[PDB]
RNA sequence: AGAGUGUAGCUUAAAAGCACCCAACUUACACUUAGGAGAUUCAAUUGACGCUCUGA
RNA sequence: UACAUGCUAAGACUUCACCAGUCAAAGCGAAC
């Protein structure tokens, strides 16, 4: 028995097919800042 | 390959403890803690 | 005597009462995530591309005392608002403000590379000579 | 059967030192007032009520595996984990009039 | 000639934040550390200076 | 890998019992 998520599930808009075309987190610090 | 050996305190005498050491390595001397004098002292092995 | 009537329960609603008595709880958990919440007041340094922010907060996230290079009273005395001298200046002014706010002990948790930064060494040094201890006292149980 | 799992569910009152969960792997993470053990068992450091939340996972800089996994994330992902908190109930103390000197 | 107009590259930023450059480690990239430049087009919400589109 | 892999002590877990097993705050003592 599954229930749909209430609001926007995190990591939804950015979930693209081409993961090799969007830049990655080069550093720990930016990941921390955003989170 | 390894031997269960015993070390005897130089200070706080009568206090001993067991460790493991390789068959080939040199004689084993450590700096342990004993509660007889409640301080850190050297332990030198006496019997395997 | 009508003067000497006291409730057997003394209520002291100062937010910092128990913390200053080293009795208030710290958030002891969070052992698997950076940073640690086990503090009362925290020093947070935000080094951005153009400016340098120094922050003293509580566990609540309530910003208590700030020293900013985005502030005219200080900005006008720096050539460049982002450099080691700016960091030293911000640490100095922050320590001066912290002494006046009644804050003398805080926790600073930098990244290992940020700790290696010379600007952060000067920040910490300036704060220490300011009279602020960058180490919180242990809780009394 | 290792008999692992949550020992105390959400909303359950907890005393200091009570074990909340026993895990082989970090299924649940220590949150507020929840300590961990060698076995990575989550015990309670305060007395109160257990809450399960979802929080942003920013791992320690020294944890090189977590660090470079974080680095490999795109600028779209943010990691989330399930954390366990103890909301403390009783105040840590009271002031009593001992003596009128 | 008419229309859309307007903050450094981008901003339902309000002189900000990311973008950006050189120097050091790296074969190199990346990280990191230390430095650099930046802007609300001019006058009184309005008009006129610059750009794009549609005309001949 | 390590030589405080020391001493003590709330509170709990556990292979359906038992015997065994785990985790651990505070404290003393030590690193820092």
Curated annotation (Swiss-Prot), chain A:
Superkingdom, natural source: Eukaryota
Location relative to the cell: Mitochondrion
Family, per entry: Belongs to the phosphatidylethanolamine-binding protein family. Mitochondrion-specific ribosomal protein mL38 subfamily.
Assembly, per entry: Component of the mitochondrial large ribosomal subunit (mt-LSU). Mature mammalian 55S mitochondrial ribosomes consist of a small (28S) and a large (39S) subunit. The 28S small subunit contains a 12S ribosomal RNA (12S mt-rRNA) and 30 different proteins. The 39S large subunit contains a 16S rRNA (16S mt-rRNA), a copy of mitochondrial valine transfer RNA (mt-tRNA(Val)), which plays an integral structural role, and 52 different proteins. mL38 is located at the central protuberance.
Protein name in the entry: Large ribosomal subunit protein mL38
Organism name: Homo sapiens (Human)
Lineage, top ranks: Eukaryota, Metazoa, Chordata, Craniata, Vertebrata
GN (gene name): MRPL38
UniProtKB/Swiss-Prot annotation, chain B:
Main location group: mitochondrion
Localization, UniProt: Mitochondrion
GO molecular function: structural constituent of ribosome
UniProt keywords, alphabetically: Mitochondrion, Ribonucleoprotein, Ribosomal protein, Transit peptide
A cellular-component GO term for this protein: mitochondrial inner membrane
Domain of life: Eukaryota
Record has Cell membrane as a keyword: no
Gene Ontology biological process terms in this record: mitochondrial translation
Family: Belongs to the bacterial ribosomal protein bL33 family.
Assembly with partners or alone: Component of the mitochondrial large ribosomal subunit (mt-LSU). Mature mammalian 55S mitochondrial ribosomes consist of a small (28S) and a large (39S) subunit. The 28S small subunit contains a 12S ribosomal RNA (12S mt-rRNA) and 30 different proteins. The 39S large subunit contains a 16S rRNA (16S mt-rRNA), a copy of mitochondrial valine transfer RNA (mt-tRNA(Val)), which plays an integral structural role, and 52 different proteins.
Name the record gives this protein: Large ribosomal subunit protein bL33m
Species annotation: Homo sapiens
Curated annotation (Swiss-Prot), chain C:
Gene Ontology terms describing biological process: mitochondrial translation; rRNA import into mitochondrion; translation
Alphabetical UniProt keywords: Chaperone, Mitochondrion, Ribonucleoprotein, Ribosomal protein, RNA-binding, Transit peptide, Transport
Compartment(s): Mitochondrion
GO cellular component terms attached to this protein's record: extracellular space; mitochondrial inner membrane; mitochondrial large ribosomal subunit; mitochondrial ribosome; mitochondrion
GO MF, any single term: 5S rRNA binding
Subunit structure: Component of the mitochondrial large ribosomal subunit (mt-LSU). Mature mammalian 55S mitochondrial ribosomes consist of a small (28S) and a large (39S) subunit. The 28S small subunit contains a 12S ribosomal RNA (12S mt-rRNA) and 30 different proteins. The 39S large subunit contains a 16S rRNA (16S mt-rRNA), a copy of mitochondrial valine transfer RNA (mt-tRNA(Val)), which plays an integral structural role, and 52 different proteins.
Family: Belongs to the universal ribosomal protein uL18 family.
Function noted in UniProt: Together with thiosulfate sulfurtransferase (TST), acts as a mitochondrial import factor for the cytosolic 5S rRNA. The precursor form shows RNA chaperone activity; is able to fold the 5S rRNA into an import-competent conformation that is recognized by rhodanese (TST). Both the cytoplasmic and mitochondrial forms are able to bind to the helix IV-loop D in the gamma domain of the 5S rRNA.
Protein name: Large ribosomal subunit protein uL18m
UniProtKB/Swiss-Prot annotation, chain D:
Entry GO CC: mitochondrial inner membrane; mitochondrial large ribosomal subunit; mitochondrion
GO molecular function: RNA binding; structural constituent of ribosome
Keywords, sorted A to Z: Mitochondrion, Ribonucleoprotein, Ribosomal protein, Transit peptide
BP-aspect Gene Ontology terms: mitochondrial translation; translation
Main subcellular localisation: mitochondrion
Top-rank lineage group of the source organism: Eukaryota
Subcellular locations according to the entry: Mitochondrion
Subunit relationships: Component of the mitochondrial large ribosomal subunit (mt-LSU). Mature mammalian 55S mitochondrial ribosomes consist of a small (28S) and a large (39S) subunit. The 28S small subunit contains a 12S ribosomal RNA (12S mt-rRNA) and 30 different proteins. The 39S large subunit contains a 16S rRNA (16S mt-rRNA), a copy of mitochondrial valine transfer RNA (mt-tRNA(Val)), which plays an integral structural role, and 52 different proteins.
Similarity comment: family membership: Belongs to the bacterial ribosomal protein bL27 family.
Protein's name in the database: Large ribosomal subunit protein bL27m
Organism: Homo sapiens
């Amino acid at each position: 028995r599954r229930t749909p998520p209430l609001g926007p599930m995190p990591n939804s808009d950015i979930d693209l097919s081409n993961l090799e075309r969007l830049e990655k987190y080069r550093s720990f610090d930016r990941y921390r800042r955003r989170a | 390959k390894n031997i269960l050996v015993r070390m005897v305190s130089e200070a706080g005498t009568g206090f001993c403890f067991n460790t493991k050491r390789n068959r080939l390595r040199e004689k084993l001397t450590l700096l342990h803690y004993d509660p007889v004098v409640k301080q850190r002292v050297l332990f030198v092995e006496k019997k395997k | 005597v009508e003067n000497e009537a006291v409730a057997p329960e003394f209520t002291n609603r100062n937010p910092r009462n128990l913390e200053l008595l080293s009795v208030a709880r710290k958030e002891r958990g969070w052992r698997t995530v950076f940073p640690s919440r086990e503090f009362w007041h925290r020093l947070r340094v935000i080094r951005t591309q153009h400016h340098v922010e120094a922050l003293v907060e509580h566990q609540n996230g309530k910003v208590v005392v700030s020293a900013s290079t985005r502030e005219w009273a200080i900005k006008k005395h720096l050539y460049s608002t982002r450099n080691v001298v700016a960091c030293e200046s911000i640490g100095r002014v922050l320590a001066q403000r912290c002494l006046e706010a009644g804050i003398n002990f805080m926790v600073y948790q930098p990244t290992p590379w940020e700790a290696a930064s010379d600007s952060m060494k000067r920040l910490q040094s300036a704060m220490t000579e300011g009279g602020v201890v960058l180490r919180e006292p242990q809780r009394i149980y | 059967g290792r008999r692992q799992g949550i020992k105390k569910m959400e909303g359950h009152y907890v005393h200091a030192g009570n074990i909340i969960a026993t895990q082989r792997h970090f299924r649940w993470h220590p949150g507020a007032h929840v300590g961990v053990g060698k076995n990575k068992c989550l015990y309670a450091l305060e007395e109160g009520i257990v809450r399960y939340t979802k929080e942003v996972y920013v791992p320690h800089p020294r944890n090189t595996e977590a660090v470079d996994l974080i680095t490999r994330l795109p600028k779209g992902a943010v990691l989330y984990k399930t954390f366990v908190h103890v909301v403390p109930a009783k105040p840590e103390g009271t002031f009593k009039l001992v003596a009128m000197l």
